[model samples]
Target chain A: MKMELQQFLDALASSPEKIEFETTMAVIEDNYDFTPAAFTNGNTQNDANENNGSCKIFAFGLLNALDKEATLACFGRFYREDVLLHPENNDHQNIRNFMVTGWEGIQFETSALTAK
Target chain B: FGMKMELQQFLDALASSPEKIEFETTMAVIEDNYDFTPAAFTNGNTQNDANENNGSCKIFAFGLLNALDKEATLACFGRFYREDVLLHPENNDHQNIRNFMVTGWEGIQFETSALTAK
Candidate 1:
């Protein structure tokens, strides 16, 4: 199931857990491996070459760890300064790019586990 | 200076004879006259035709609002979502089909049909 990026984020923001930014990053790093070369084919989950990695998959995993319903979502680079997410999928880009700069503007997508 | 059509006038013209104004033509006029590129044209995967992208309507609407120097608000249909959900022009895909439009322009709702013959 594919969920809107805003809907997913709203869920996260409203969650009682209040998952910290660092915890979310830790979950991504511990559970998933970064492999940009694997996603050159496409942004789909199956396109990921690593066993449990890729920015898209990491985002999905993060949603799951947070107990959000989304399983698939639109991926892109979000600009925090302008509050604008580049309309293109940046799943094919390197995860290091996000890590080096920070995850303040990482925009991920996922479907809700159950209808809200 | 050449007179540029107001946003309302352009929309009214679209409502009057949508056939005469193609989406591309509308975008061209907006870009050339309004001095702003429509959101539909800014996407990396954007196509020449607006119909190819489901969010083109809303993107075009935002572009129109920006062109007119109006306060364009981001609004969506269905469940209320956060403003940060990224209402991308192409990425929205089917999620925006008949589900997105620009409102609050003189109490007018700018929908896809209003901008295109389809």
Candidate 2:
């Protein structure tokens, strides 16, 4: 069964388990989480890139009460918004609706996710 | 004196940067070096060509979390630079004039106790 579930008891009593970056990775369709770990199955950060089906993953952290930072979590490849806009994930960047608006006359529209 | 508020400062120094032709208008009402006071700025309007009425651009402010860096540097004021953005709903190729900021943060973040660090 392709059960994508990890059921474990307590980390203190149980053995090691493999987990990824949670939902953020799902949205981007990639497997990356539990950072700073290495294995022999080619899990080095260097082998991660778009060519190898990877994209820029980020971990949101704060600096001070006045500012926050966008930290790069890891890398994994996902379809570009331009590609996602179209049905093809491998299309050259071209005409596409920059963003789908929530409503007309609403100036506070969230900026479209960056596109390549 | 120029109060440089970068929407995304990265574009400011880019080879193909958008000159705010409307840049000066930002301060037409507020001006520069004006001390920020609560009771002062009450009701204001349109920031640029991208904003007009309550129905334009974005709220003067939004969001605070996840904006600063680990160094506690203030990184408020967000501007989304679009290399692929067009001037009008119909135009595509002729990219010009920067898009204004549609978001603002409360500014920087750090450990609460650090504020009193002597």
Candidate 3:
């Protein structure tokens, strides 16, 4: 697994709730120094966008790794308008691949988040 | 052949999986339980990722469309839900259009130039 992913998973498991978004978010945005980024490509907020994307992936990955059913759709939780609409922006493919393939014994269970 | 086969398999599985049922229910939960406003797509999450987005309906909508492989649904959602999504909260017209885009409601058929007239 990637270092960033490992760091996030460790943070997620360390919390009292062990599965809460707030705690995990604190680790991703605060501890990880990730903040929301601009959604567009040319904008100055591109960094912010990527940073947030990074945080988004970790949050999704943690739940995905821990959940027994794996039914939770991680990608759905974030703003993927670029990837979804353009299909050419492969910027986050690495993260996507990690979530899809990284974790152990984890299944990509069906989730309402996957609904169209 | 692989990509085609994969998408086909995805469609087939989507047709009967329990997740499919869950997706429908959550989308409704988003619609009925929270704000009845139009569903958001772009900028729905300040983080540019829906995973930790603020709007419940926005998160649910993204998940639902993505699950359906919405990319293939209308073709150019970038315009359908793209640039338009940048509008502010008061500018609800953008969100209204988003709701319309999601359903591909009526004359708003799927096309590369889906947002051309707008």
Candidate 4:
């Protein structure tokens, strides 16, 4: 399981889009406890230290706070349901919704994870 | 004066690469030179681009991490240069990018770090 999960993550990280998606997911996961008011605006340095100086988490949080569109640029409507609806994961839906929002020139398509 | 924060700065930084040095140093350089800060979240209603926010930091970090080593680098970025075929989303084409990053990293990893060491 460890090897496979690591392999899965390594493969997932290959795409710029997946990196953005997972980066945001990791960012949100690291800060999952923050109040929307304080977490979004408070000292991210503390957040970084609390998360044990992870650059991945730092990149995730940095983008989350600032360039959400760039963060959102990581997603699309093209993932399979197995990838999207995995039982143990909490973020598949949220990631999918963010992807559905689209970015730069990518637009919405039918069967979006998010609805208008 | 133009802040020549070129790709080599990042390459050099990662050459021996303190883990947190990666985060704080870039933060310091960009803050001093580019005069910007990164954020945690944004109002989705606003029509802002990441460039309008801290996109330079993203580019800075992306390039730094991408050049770390072929596997970690291209795994984080992707193998295809923009000029390369934008290629389909399927795994077949993705493998090509995978090979491309691995292949590119194979030759230059030493030069990117060890060879030019002080």
Best by TM-score: 1
Off by over 4 Å in 3: A1-57, A60-116, B1-118
lDDT of each: 0.32, 0.21, 0.32, 0.31
Task: Evaluate residue A21 in candidate 4 and report its C-alpha lDDT on the 0 to 100 scale.
Answer: 37
Please give the distance, in angstroms, between residue B17's alpha carbon in candidate 4 and its true position after superposition. 2.8
What lDDT tens digits, residue by residue, belong to model 1 across residues A1-116? 12243334454445523433333334334433343322221223233334233444443332232111111221222222112243344433333243332222232221111111
DockQ numbers for every candidate? Answer: 0.02, 0.09, 0.02, 0.01
Listed in order, each prediction's TM-score against the native is: 0.23, 0.19, 0.22, 0.21
CA-based DockQ, model 1: 0.02
Q: Candidate 1 at B50: error in angstroms?
A: 15
lDDT of 1 by residue, B1-118 (tens): 6755455565565556543444444554444443222222222222223344433444344333322222222222112212323345445543333233322222222211112111
Q: Is candidate 2 or candidate 4 better by DockQ?
A: 2
Model 4: docking quality category: incorrect
TM-score ranking from best to worst? 1, 3, 4, 2
Model 4: residue A81 alpha-carbon error in angstroms: 8.6
Off by over 4 Å in 4: A1-77, A81-116, B1-3, B19-25, B32-118
Answer with 1 or 2, whichever has the higher lDDT: 1
**Of candidates 3 and 2, the better by DockQ:** 2
Error of 2 at A8 (Å): 22
lDDT of 4 by residue, A1-116 (tens): 11232232343345434443344444344433322111111112223223222222223323222133333343322233334445455444434443443221111111111100
